[PDB]
Amino acid sequence: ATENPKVTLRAPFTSEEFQGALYAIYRHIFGNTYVMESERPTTAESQLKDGRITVRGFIRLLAKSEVYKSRFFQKTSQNRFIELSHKLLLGRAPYDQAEISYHLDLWNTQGYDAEIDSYVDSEEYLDFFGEDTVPFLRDFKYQTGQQGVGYSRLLNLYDGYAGSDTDRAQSGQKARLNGTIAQAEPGSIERPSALQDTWKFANPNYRNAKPPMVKALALEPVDLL
Amino acid sequence: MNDVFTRAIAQADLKGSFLLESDLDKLASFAKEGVKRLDAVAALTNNAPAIISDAAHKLFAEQQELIQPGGNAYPHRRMAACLRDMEIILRYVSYALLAGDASVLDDRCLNGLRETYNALGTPTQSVARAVQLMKDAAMVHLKSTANVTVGDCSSLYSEAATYFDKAAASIA
Amino acid sequence: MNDVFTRAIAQADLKGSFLLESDLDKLASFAKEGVKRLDAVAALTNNAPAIISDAAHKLFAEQQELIQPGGNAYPHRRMAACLRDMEIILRYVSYALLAGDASVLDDRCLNGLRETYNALGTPTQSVARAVQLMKDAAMVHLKSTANVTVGDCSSLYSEAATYFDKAAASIA
Amino acid sequence: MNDVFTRAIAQADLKGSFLLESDLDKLASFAKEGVKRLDAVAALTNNAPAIISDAAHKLFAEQQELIQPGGNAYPHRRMAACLRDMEIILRYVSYALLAGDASVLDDRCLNGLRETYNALGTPTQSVARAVQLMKDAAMVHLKSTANVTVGDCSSLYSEAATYFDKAAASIA
Amino acid sequence: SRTVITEVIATADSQGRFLNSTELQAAFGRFERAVPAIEAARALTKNQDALVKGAVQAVFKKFPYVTQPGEKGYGDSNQAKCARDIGYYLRFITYSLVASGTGPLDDYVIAGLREVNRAFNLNPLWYIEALNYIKGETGKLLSGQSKTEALLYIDHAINALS
Amino acid sequence: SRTVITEVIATADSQGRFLNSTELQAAFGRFERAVPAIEAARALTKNQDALVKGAVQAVFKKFPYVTQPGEKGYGDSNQAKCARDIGYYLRFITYSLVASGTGPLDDYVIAGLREVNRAFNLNPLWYIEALNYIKGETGKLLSGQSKTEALLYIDHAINALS
Amino acid sequence: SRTVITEVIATADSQGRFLNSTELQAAFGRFERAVPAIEAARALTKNQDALVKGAVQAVFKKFPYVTQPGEKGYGDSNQAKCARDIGYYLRFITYSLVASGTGPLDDYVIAGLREVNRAFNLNPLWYIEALNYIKGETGKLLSGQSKTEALLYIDHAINALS
Amino acid sequence: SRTVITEVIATADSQGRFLNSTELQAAFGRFERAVPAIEAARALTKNQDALVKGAVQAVFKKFPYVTQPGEKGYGDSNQAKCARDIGYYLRFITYSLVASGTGPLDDYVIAGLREVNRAFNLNPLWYIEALNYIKGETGKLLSGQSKTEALLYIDHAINALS
Amino acid sequence: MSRTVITEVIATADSQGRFLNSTELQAAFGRFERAVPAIEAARALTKNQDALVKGAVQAVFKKFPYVTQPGEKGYGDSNQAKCARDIGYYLRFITYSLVASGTGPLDDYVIAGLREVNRAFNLNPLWYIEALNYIKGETGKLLSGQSKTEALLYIDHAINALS
Amino acid sequence: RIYKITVSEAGAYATNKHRTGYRAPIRQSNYTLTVPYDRFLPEMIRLHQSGAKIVNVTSV
Ligand SMILES: CCC1=C(C)/C(=C/C2=NC(=C\c3[nH]c(/C=C4\NC(=O)[C@H](C)[C@H]4CC)c(C)c3CCC(=O)O)/C(CCC(=O)O)=C2C)NC1=O
Ligand SMILES: CCC1=C(C)/C(=C/C2=NC(=C\c3[nH]c(/C=C4\NC(=O)[C@H](C)[C@H]4CC)c(C)c3CCC(=O)O)/C(CCC(=O)O)=C2C)NC1=O
Ligand SMILES: CCC1=C(C)/C(=C/C2=NC(=C\c3[nH]c(/C=C4\NC(=O)[C@H](C)[C@H]4CC)c(C)c3CCC(=O)O)/C(CCC(=O)O)=C2C)NC1=O
Ligand SMILES: CCC1=C(C)/C(=C/C2=NC(=C\c3[nH]c(/C=C4\NC(=O)[C@H](C)[C@H]4CC)c(C)c3CCC(=O)O)/C(CCC(=O)O)=C2C)NC1=O
Ligand SMILES: CCC1=C(C)/C(=C/C2=NC(=C\c3[nH]c(/C=C4\NC(=O)[C@H](C)[C@H]4CC)c(C)c3CCC(=O)O)/C(CCC(=O)O)=C2C)NC1=O
């Protein structure tokens, strides 16, 4: 949300900016999942370095690659794929059931690449990331078109800094917002276990009243006077 | 995604051993009946609109409450969603039939489908009935003798029924 | 992510107070010994491949079940992920040794790590073992008196040990 | 980007031989006046709003055709763009001052700023006059000996005026 | 906060690499400049009462039209809040000096500054005048590198106000 | 893994469509090639021990220095690990032959090969020599299309290691 | 290239802001550290030839099989290539010392290093041992802080190779 | 134009890798299945005129109302357009047979089908009945695997219409 | 969800993160003024629904006399009765769209998924187009003035969706 | 086929950025976009909605 800077890469750039930008791109678009050296796309980043494609075109190529499909598409329900795609390509969570219906129909009709295009050719992607900056999780700060459920739902989709969106869990790759979006509910705000040691002396509920052990009763003038 | 071959390989790798001769002969069988499997898959693919149409007609003759106002297949949006789901389930059944393994259906189509349908408000019993009707319609085309050399395909019929039954049981 | 200075500042802010004289003295002490801290960070950074190699060798000598077919580090993919994990934990321990506060570990390195390991089925005991092995291998390079001025750097050794222990305890 | 040290390294690498004693002596002198360079950069930074405001006031008093309706800086948005352009040019100039190389200013900005100003319809001599007024305003703050120890920085003034006039001539 | 150590570590992490020479030299510079910075923080902390009351008085002199009834400065509560605000600014300046980075100033004063001032109709020129007075008094309380450090952070706050 | 049937179903799935004639034609080619492929897998599984021992011996002939004291091939545990590794490669080549694709190799050897070899300082050239010996010997065995099927996967492994 | 000053300027430009306390403190650390670094660069430029000759011979003692006919180190041309490569590394170490940043080593050696060595079958351990020898004589040649600077840049190179 | 070879090339190009065992076996299956599809292409190209006229008559029989005036079938121009459209369908089905792929149909008929049928009011059941006629004819003009090829491509075109 | 004037007003102001300015109040005002014609039109169409539905069924039969032949869709009593059901659906969704003063109800209930259901059940859009043209003709008799224009705007939106 | 579009960002786009703001960093006005045929219509209509003015569209 705050500490990591927004990685931007214009067409003229030096070596360290390029290498760091690719590190950030792979650490975001591919979940937090490890991408082995046999999976790194060399032609795609040659095209990025030359300036044939922007960062947005590179993101499109990466989301259409089989690293992305194998992790987030081929072992998933479409609900999970849509959740992940929103998180990883728009930086937010699905707001409505209408988005899931729209994207499911779009994939069923026109196939996977048109779906990735709708994610990356959207006016919201261009508003927040344009062509130069890597996507980032953006619903942890209030932006103009946010909705009340976005914070909770993204926080539900975000598993911490050391978590990842891996298909290699023993439970597999499962949708976690498939029920909350249909009911139009918020998301779960239960954070990892490593964090119950942070700022334990804060007292947000300071105004809360402790109840008495027994309620005050009036035997004569009635009981609630 | 797994087929019979990759499934046998993964099982063998789990114990860190080569593929036994028994496994190789089973896979050689599967390969030899591969052509019958291909004809089964083609029958499912090519007759899909007819399968789904017959299934829809039967289902919405039995269950009027779906297509009434307040039913879950009432407006064109919901009815289109119904037919779309039926075609997607049939598609994944055919994928699994070609694969010889049911893992694609479980991983993709049925992963959390019951929770999805419960969330949306869909009668999962009606979805299971639609899948059973699709199975009944599909067996008719799977057994079509025309346009193919005569032979034995009883195992393939049992396998297709197995994948349809898996889908129906997982949904409801 | 805080350093020692920002931690002191946050406490002073909560009190609404300027930093007391004794607080400024403890901070001037920390910065006055900062050169030894930088040398210890350089020792950790420069020898990191050696530390990870030695920890890995000892860990897989002790626990052969990790590298047997069916173990959690069996194929190349899992072994590469394991080595990356050791790399990452050493990286963050060096970050914490530079800052002087173990907030970087719980904020970043150990944020959701235990949940990750549970969901993947990684034996957290073996991970904590790997961290202890890295701690032991790192202490050798931290005490290395070659190329540096002789001096008392026991506070640094204890602090680094506590960072390694905080990791191995948060995973386990 | 590129620095004076980086520039010298690049020239040495083009001929593929070690940096000569004369080059090392010049770079040592640069590092010796680095403290003065830091003061000059801090002087530019700490009074940047004052520099912008003085340059803008003098420019708009000089050229009222920009203020009046139909001018290139008439509405609030065009005024704000004017001020933002002055600010970014100053920021790049201070970058060049700190690095000692004009690359940070020449690379990203001045190459396309020509086409941008031509397309938008801005009077280019007006923008060059704005940058020159910025230089004139900034020299006073660079000279201000208050709060800094008395010393000679004629090289720094020459280099800063060089960067200012270079940007103004580029946009011109 | 965005102190030298923290920004070093954060940029190192965002690139997935250890701390190299560049970062260690930056940290070394920070640990060396600690001495003038801690000295400036001591000087300002010892003299916080005189500094803040003088700043409030300087504001009331450069803005005479504020003290009269009918506007912001009239009333004991409003002047108490004036002194409290300048005490806040000076506190966070000393925090920046101790931390050797504008992180405390940024996080605690600059983020949300304009919106808060607009909402409560607090003129930034008031705090600019108070900080200018504090800059003047630190010119006398401090010498050498301590003065440069303190003035650097005070000017950062002023530029953020204007 | 990525075997012919799996790319077939995967492309159909990603495009949201049924399996068309092209997909079934690729599957039919797969089912034809299953015969020499499983024959080759049978032959390699039968002769695994001799192939492994010969490959280890070839490695030690090509890189004699490896077995000197203090070198990676010194001792019995190191050479047993050598034998285990060559058996691994042979196992996964037979798996790839059976599954008609490089999915088993890609997923259990190539994914992570370079990082692992670099961390433990294992020279890929050793495995190149071992796989070259396995190639030469599977030339003697495996007449026909079985030979070509085997060499395709042996070459995939060798090309990965380089 | 990655220097201290360039990291300063890029971090300032990326956030669209001016240079400030943290960044000027990093630059001040650079300017303070320049003296040992320029001194080490001078001392290493004096003794380039002896260092390179010793490093080449060190590799040849450590990997005696390399000099054997049919191997990489056999032939005067290959040994001239070896000396040229060690000279390359030493030159970029001196550049990095002058720049107070690993930017030169990064850009001119490390970027592309693994793929190039893989393509030409250049064992990184050769260059690691040669850099170890250079590290050894840096202790004799340099003392003080120039010693530490040279050693940390050499260790950066060795970490990149290993 | 998606074919077996085209998908072969597209996958390996997207992954940035050489063509390997998997898609080579896919291309092999395509090459083997070429000859029955090729001679089925021979068969449909030979008998094109009779098939087109018969399909036109079958359509005008199943939809008698189209013939009478005020409908789409009235007129020699509309009749020639019917024959032309059915000939287009047959030509592209033969193209799919010779190409061993659905690509020709997808590119030349299926893409933009529903939009222009809605715009020109061309009922898809007309062409569905024509294609069912041609299905009946290819049932007798072809035997063996070529019958299956023609039937798969024809009924794929039907499904695209339905 | 539904695209009423008010809803798009609010959605536009919300996407821009601003309050409702004078322009949007103008739009709302105009909608509130067109409410009266729309509501009286919906009332007139609701009273006269039975003749509309029966006449639409008859017109579809007349224009396509072959659908009542055996083996065709119109054959059977159930098919025709629930054809009357479909026409009633279209009619009351048109009334909904009139009342809402926006085509939202049509786009949401009939138009979304119209083509796919028509295909899957092999139903000619021309049948319903003929029925909606019959209603378009008869509404001129039922309605007069601006309410007539509103009704025909919505009926033709339905037709164009089918067209 | 691939189509290269040279778009010049003009006052129509500058007004939109002055109203909405810069949630993304400011960039030079003249840049070239490369599109496939499938994407040419959506990208070009999008550039129109953004207010950008295309200069030259070249095929390749
Ligand atoms: C914030 C810093 C950070 C950390 C700490 C981190 C840890 C991390 N380790 C992972 C996997 C793993 N981690 C291990 C390591 C364990 N298994 C072995 O037995 C050892 C005993 C032990 C290591 C010493 C293994 C084997 C995997 C792969 C699990 C699998 O492939 O099934 C993954 C899953 C990524 C993926 O596979 O796509 C993460 C996110 N990630 C981060 O971004
Ligand atoms: C690719 C794997 C996959 C599938 C197949 C899947 C199914 C799925 N079905 C959905 C809705 C639906 N599904 C149905 C179908 C059912 N309702 C009727 O009663 C029938 C009995 C029955 C069909 C035979 C209906 C009507 C809806 C819409 C319900 C609603 O809008 O609330 C949705 C939500 C999108 C929407 O609202 O249209 C999904 C995601 N999800 C997946 O990730
Ligand atoms: C579109 C609907 C919507 C709303 C309304 C919304 C509110 C919202 N308030 C937030 C933080 C906050 N909100 C408050 C407000 C509280 N402080 C005091 O206690 C008051 C009692 C109270 C306000 C009257 C504060 C202080 C924070 C900062 C807490 C923090 O960031 O740590 C955040 C976290 C992101 C950020 O810091 O900007 C959100 C998302 N989000 C939405 O999507
Ligand atoms: C382009 C895609 C493609 C298809 C469609 C295809 C079909 C195909 N079907 C075949 C035969 C066959 N097909 C069947 C299946 C039939 N047996 C029963 O009648 C069932 C009703 C029915 C199953 C649906 C059988 C039994 C054979 C003979 C194989 C044998 O007896 O071993 C053969 C072997 C040669 C022949 O006998 O003609 C092929 C290649 N090949 C392809 O590359
Ligand atoms: C399933 C895929 C897979 C492969 C391929 C694999 C290879 C592999 N071999 C290893 C050890 C080793 N492997 C060798 C092989 C050498 N021995 C010498 O005699 C020969 C010259 C040479 C072989 C030709 C050696 C020496 C070691 C010990 C390295 C060490 O202890 O650092 C290790 C390090 C961990 C261990 O097992 O102790 C791996 C990961 N591991 C896997 O999970």
Ligand SMILES: CCC1=C(C)/C(=C/C2=NC(=C\c3[nH]c(/C=C4\NC(=O)[C@H](C)[C@H]4CC)c(C)c3CCC(=O)O)/C(CCC(=O)O)=C2C)NC1=O
């Ligand atoms: C480029 C980055 C950089 C580094 C790495 C750096 C290290 C550094 N090490 C130093 C000496 C030292 N280094 C150490 C640390 C060592 N003492 C040994 O016994 C222990 C094994 C070990 C840790 C306890 C000590 C104790 C001193 C002398 C005491 C002191 O300088 O305060 C000094 C002070 C110079 C002196 O007074 O002689 C520096 C600046 N400086 C830099 O600018």
Ligand SMILES: CCC1=C(C)/C(=C/C2=NC(=C\c3[nH]c(/C=C4\NC(=O)[C@H](C)[C@H]4CC)c(C)c3CCC(=O)O)/C(CCC(=O)O)=C2C)NC1=O
């Ligand atoms: C079309 C949109 C537009 C507006 C609204 C606008 C206002 C405006 N007035 C200005 C000058 C000024 N405006 C004032 C206004 C003050 N004078 C006092 O009598 C009053 C208390 C108070 C007015 C209520 C003053 C004192 C100045 C001179 C100081 C300065 O801003 O440079 C300036 C600075 C540059 C200039 O001289 O134009 C602007 C931008 N300019 C525009 O292009």
Ligand SMILES: CCC1=C(C)/C(=C/C2=NC(=C\c3[nH]c(/C=C4\NC(=O)[C@H](C)[C@H]4CC)c(C)c3CCC(=O)O)/C(CCC(=O)O)=C2C)NC1=O
């Ligand atoms: C790499 C750094 C960089 C620079 C330097 C840059 C300059 C720049 N100036 C612009 C407009 C402008 N620039 C100016 C400024 C000039 N016009 C005159 O009035 C003034 C005397 C003079 C200021 C000294 C003005 C007034 C506009 C508005 C033109 C318009 O809106 O039509 C624009 C168009 C974008 C927009 O208006 O929102 C750019 C891109 N952009 C960058 O990314």
Ligand SMILES: CCC1=C(C)/C(=C/C2=NC(=C\c3[nH]c(/C=C4\NC(=O)[C@H](C)[C@H]4CC)c(C)c3CCC(=O)O)/C(CCC(=O)O)=C2C)NC1=O
């Ligand atoms: C926190 C950020 C930071 C700053 C701001 C900084 C400035 C700085 N200025 C200095 C003195 C100086 N400053 C200047 C520059 C001034 N002399 C003339 O008056 C010019 C008008 C003017 C230049 C614009 C000079 C010439 C010296 C003395 C250097 C010398 O000749 O020895 C010194 C050395 C003081 C000493 O050790 O005796 C420093 C460190 N260093 C930092 O780390």
Ligand SMILES: CCC1=C(C)/C(=C/C2=NC(=C\c3[nH]c(/C=C4\NC(=O)[C@H](C)[C@H]4CC)c(C)c3CCC(=O)O)/C(CCC(=O)O)=C2C)NC1=O
């Ligand atoms: C959103 C409002 C809505 C509409 C518009 C709608 C129409 C509609 N008509 C249907 C069936 C049908 N529709 C017809 C067509 C009619 N039958 C003949 O009397 C006429 C000639 C002809 C109309 C002019 C027929 C014959 C069927 C049943 C057989 C079939 O289509 O396969 C179906 C499929 C399920 C069912 O049997 O009810 C729908 C969804 N349903 C809705 O919920």
